[PDB]
Paper text:
Local refinement of C16-N resulted in a map obtained from 81,353 particles and that reached an estimated 3.47 Å average resolution. Although the N-terminal domain closely resembles PHD2 in structure, and retains the cleft that accommodates the iron-oxoglutarate in that protein family, the key residues that bind the cofactor in these oxidase enzymes, are not conserved in C16, suggesting that it does not have enzymatic activity. Dimerisation of the N-terminal domains involves antiparallel β-sheet interactions between residues Met1–Tyr4 on the edge strands of the central β-sheet from each subunit, and between residues Gly123-Lys126 on the outer β-sheet from each subunit. Interestingly, a piece of unattached density was evident, bound in a cleft formed at the interface of the two C16 molecules on the dyad axis of the N-terminal domains. This protein density did not correspond to any segment of the C16 molecules in the homodimer, which were fully accounted for. Unfortunately, the resolution of the map did not permit unambiguous identification of the sequence of residues present in this extra density, but is expected to contain largely negatively charged amino acids since the walls of the cleft are intensely positively charged, formed by lysines 115, 117, 126, 140, 142 and 143 from each of the N-terminal domains. This finding suggests that the cleft is likely to serve as a region for protein-protein interaction. Notably, the lysines involved in forming this cleft in C16 are not conserved in C4, which does not show the same propensity to oligomerisation. Supporting the idea that structural differences between the N-terminal domains of C4 and C16 reflect functional differences in the cell, the N-terminal domain of C16, but not that of C4, has been reported to interact with PHD219.
Residue numbers in the entry:
A (entry chain C), B (entry chain D): 1 to 161
Amino acid sequence: MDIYDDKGLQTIKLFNNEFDCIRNDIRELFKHVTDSDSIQLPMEDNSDIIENIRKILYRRLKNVECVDIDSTITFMKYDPNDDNKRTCSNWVPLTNNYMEYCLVIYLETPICGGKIKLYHPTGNIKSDKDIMFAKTLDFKSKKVLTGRKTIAVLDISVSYN
Amino acid sequence: MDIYDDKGLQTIKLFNNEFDCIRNDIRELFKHVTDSDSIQLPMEDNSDIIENIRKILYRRLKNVECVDIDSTITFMKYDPNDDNKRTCSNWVPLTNNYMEYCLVIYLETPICGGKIKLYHPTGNIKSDKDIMFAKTLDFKSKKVLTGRKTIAVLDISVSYN
């Protein structure tokens, strides 16, 4: 499932089984974290996972001409808390064939709740799988009921033709 | 707002400024209603609406070979105190590049509530605009609670290349 804009640019992408082995790799990388709700690890040493993510995005996208991935990878933990609609300050791109996305990979899918809600004038989207969504859109991290929730977030800039 | 599946077949279309040219004509068509919850008017001597719908679909849908429009219109009004449920539609096309859709054009929008909400194991979409979705999906009409919600339904059948 992928979502496009009226201009033609891709805005949202929903993954099902694309991130399988890198899930275990990210789990192993995140094993070295001590009591952090949101911890950012700059990743330029073991760039193998970054190369795999770049190749996956190159093969499973449309008309992609270049891909740029930020080195740092952030990890977030969630407990039965509230959270709210963390809007983005209307990041407006400059060109017309370029877009910066946030990619979220689920390390421990919550049993109940923990769905990334996305707000758009034409309609809302609620999902529980790995996501790649535009920084322009406004997202909410809905509260969980049972179980924990761990996510890995990356910033990726792509260009189209 | 384009939506595509893993095969590349378009599934959901969200028109914002597309049908706000014939909406008055649909309103005049709806006027001939006599206390029917869901009236399936066989409309034949109004083919101008069909022609404009076909033109819009041909122009704003990508990679189109033929659009087969059906010659009936179903007006459904949803009472504030009337509730609904799932639909659980089981239907699979027998060919590759072909899909039957359901075009919902809003004639009387509600003040709040009662959006059309669509199910999928990788995301749910809630919307209150002009929607066009395939018959392979289970959908729900949410409980309206303010005002009235009267919609017009066509039956689409599109074959691509």
